[PDB]
Amino acid sequence: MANRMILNETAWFGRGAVGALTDEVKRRGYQKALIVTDKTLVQCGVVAKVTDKMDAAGLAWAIYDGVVPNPTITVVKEGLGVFQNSGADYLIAIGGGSPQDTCKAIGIISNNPEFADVRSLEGLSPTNKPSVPILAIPTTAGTAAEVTINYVITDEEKRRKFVCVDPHDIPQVAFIDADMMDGMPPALKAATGVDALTHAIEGYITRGAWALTDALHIKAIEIIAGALRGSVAGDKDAGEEMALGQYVAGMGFSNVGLGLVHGMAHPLGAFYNTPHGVANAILLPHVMRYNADFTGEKYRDIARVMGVKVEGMSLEEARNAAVEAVFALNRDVGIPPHLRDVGVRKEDIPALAQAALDDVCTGGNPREATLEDIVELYHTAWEG
C-alpha cells in the first residue's frame, strides 16, 4: 500500500550547473571517468564544455561516443567493453536519453555480470548490486533519464525496445544545465519537449498516481506547456524553464508509471527508429481521447495549466479542450500530425499493436487496452 520514491540524492539546476561537476568528483574521490555520449555531441562541442572543465581541474577521463539514437544491445555491449578496459571508476553520461540509457545499462551490467546479454534486464531488473556511479548531464529537454530508474534498449534480433526498471541504476548526481541544451535544433527541442509533456500527462493519469506525483506532474505540465513554444523559438529563459520542467516530470513518472502512449511509441522506435518524442507527440492526443472517461477531473487540470479557460466548462468539454490543446501545441511547434508522415506502414500495425500490448509501460494506462483498441488507435493516428 505504501508508495516508494526514488530520486537523485544530489542534483544541480540552472545554467552553469555543470560547473559543479569537478567539485563533486573531487569530493567523491573518483580517479577516472568514462564519458558515454555520441558523435554529434562531440562534433557540436557539447562534450568539450565538460572535458575542458575537467582538464582545468586535472581530472582524468576517456570517451565512448558510439551511442546511436534508440540505443541497441550491440551499442551497450560495445560501450561496456570500452568501460571495463578503461579502468574508470565512474561514468559521466553526456547526452539525451540514448547516451543516458546506454550509460545506465553499462553501469548495471558492469556490477551485475549475470545480465551480460542485456535483454534479460527488461521489466523489474532483478539486479543485486548498484550500478557503477553515474553523474548524468542531459543535453535534451525531454527524457529525464538523469532522474528516472528506467532505461530502454533496442533488441535488434527480436526487433523490440525493452524498458528496464531498476532502482540500482539511479544516477548519483545529475546536472541540469540549459547551456548544455541550447544547441538542440528547434525540431529536437519540440520533439523532446512533447516527450516531456507526455511523461507528465501519462504520469498524472497513470494507475499508480498518488498525491506527491500528482503535485509534481501537474507543475511539470504547467512549466512545459508555458515554455515549449518559446524555447523552440530560441528564447533563453524558456530553455531553462524546459530544463526544469522535463526533470520535474521525471521525479513523478519514474515512481508511478506512464501509459499507452509510451507503450505504442516504443514499437515504432523498434520498427522504424522513429524519434521517441515524435512518436509520442503524434500518439498523445489520440490516446488521451481514448483514456478520457477514466481520468476523473484531471483533464480539467491539464487544460487549465495549458492556457484553456476551463471555468464554467463541463467535464466533457474540459476533456475535449485538453485534447485540443495538445493537438494545437503539436501544430505550433511543427511536429507532423500523422504516423504516415513519419514512415509507419499499415501492414505493420498488427505486430506493432501486439508489441504495444506487451510493452512494460502499457500496464499503467488508466483504461485497460485490448489488442483491437490499440490497432484502432494506430489506424486513427495513421492519417487523422
Add this chain to the structure above:
Amino acid sequence: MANRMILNETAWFGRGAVGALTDEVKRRGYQKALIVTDKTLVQCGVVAKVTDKMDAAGLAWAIYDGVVPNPTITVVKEGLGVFQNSGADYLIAIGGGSPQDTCKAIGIISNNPEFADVRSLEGLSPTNKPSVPILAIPTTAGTAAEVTINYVITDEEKRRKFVCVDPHDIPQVAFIDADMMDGMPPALKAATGVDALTHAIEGYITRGAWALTDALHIKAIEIIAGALRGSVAGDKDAGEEMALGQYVAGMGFSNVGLGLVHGMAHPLGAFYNTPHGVANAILLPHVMRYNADFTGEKYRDIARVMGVKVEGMSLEEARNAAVEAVFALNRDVGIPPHLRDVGVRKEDIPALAQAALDDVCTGGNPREATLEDIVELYHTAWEGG
C-alpha cells in the same frame, strides 16, 4: 548561481511504510543496526513496531534510547560510544527531530573522528566522509529531519543550540509512516505541525528560494493548513496528510534555508528547553508581519492555500490575511499565544536577541535583521505587544 538539491535517494510513504524496512536492509547487505530513539517511544511500543518486524526477518539490532528533547553534546557522545561498542554497521533513527538529529551527529562523527567535540560541526561542516548509513523513521509530523541535511545539537556549556548543515548526513532511506505518528498527544501534533508549517512558510520566502522549492513549499503549506486541525482532532486521514506535508516542506527548506522564526526559536530552546514547535508557533505570525514588505506576492499565495478567499483584496490586505490565518490556526490547535505563557523572561531578551542574530538560520530571512529588530520582536511576542 546554480541551485543544489539534496534529497533521500529512497523513501517510502504511507501508512504501513515501515513494512518496507526489512527488505531495504537486506537489499543493502547491512549486518546489524543501532536504533537511536528515546525512552518514551520505547515505552509507548513504537520502537517495538519496528524491532518486531526485524526479529521476524532475522535482522540484528541494538538500541540506544538515551536521547532527550533538544539533544545535547553529552547525549551525542554517549550515543556514539554505544554505536561503537555495539558492532552495528548502520543506524536506524526512530523518533522526532531529537533522536533523528542525534543519529545524524553520531553517524557523521563515527566516520569523521576529528569532530568528536561535536560543537565543531556547527555551520557548513567540513566533513570528508559520508555518515554511517542512516534509515530514518519519523514519529512526529513536523521536523522533516529524515530528508533535510541539517541537525541541531544543544551545547549545554555555552547554553546554545547549534545548527549543523552537511550533505554527508542525508539518510539513505526514509520511511514516512503515519502509523508511527498516531500516538502523538494532540498538543504534540499541534506543536510539530506548526513547526512544519513554519518550515514551509519560511522556506517559501527565504532569500535562496527558487522555482523548484517554491513549488514544494506552497504545496506543503496547502497540505498542512488543510489537515492540521483534523489531525489534532484525531482524524486518521489527516494524520497521513500531515506526514506527507511535513516531509514535502523539508524537501524544500533543507535546500534553500529558513529565516528569523527559527533563528529566534533556537535560543529559546537553549535557554528554557522550550519545545521547538511551540517556540516557532508563537514567533511565526510576528516574524511574518516583520518580513511582509520583502515577500512580494507570496503572502497572497499563503493566505489562499490557507482557506482565505483573496479574490478581491489588495496586497496589503492579503498580507494581513496570511498573518491572521496563522494566528487563527495557532488558536484553533491550542498553542499559547504569548512567550510569557511558556516560561520566557523579559530580562533574557537582550541575550536571546544576540543569540538569534548569530543563529545559522537567521541569515536566510528576507529582511536583514538587526539586533534591535530582534529585541523588538521578542518583546512583541512577549504578551502580544
